[PDB]
Design a protein around this nucleic acid. Structure first.
Length: 90
DNA sequence: AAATTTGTTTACTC
DNA sequence: GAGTAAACAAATTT
């Protein structure tokens, strides 16, 4: 099922985070010191930061792509090293 | 020139 | 609106 109580960032039990894809991505982008990440770094962040997402990659990688291009507060910016995603706080 | 990842939509529940 | 699934197209690497 989903999270049994109020426990904080324990990523060590395969339990669904009680957060939207829209908001998890927003948090992953703002974690980077430059406030941007590549799509792969977002994939690495999700797996690293939650045990639940280590089991069915195709199910949620599709979701992450979907949310990025559906919400106006996610913006793609071309960099020297390639495409990255940023967040419009407004 | 594929192959494959990375971006956009659309639609269907709930 | 959120999560999921999918069809289809763009941009990017083998």
């Amino acid at each position: 099922p989903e999270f049994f109580h109020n426990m904080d960032y324990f990523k060590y039990h395969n339990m669904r985070p009680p957060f939207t894809y829209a908001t998890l991505i927003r948090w992953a982008i703002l974690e980077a010191p430059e406030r941007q990440r590549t799509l792969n770094e977002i994939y690495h962040w999700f797996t690293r930061m939650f045990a639940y997402f280590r089991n069915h990659p195709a199910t949620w990688k599709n979701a992450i792509r979907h949310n990025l291009s559906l919400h106006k507060c996610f913006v793609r910016v071309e960099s020297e090293k390639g495409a990255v995603w940023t967040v419009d706080e407004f």
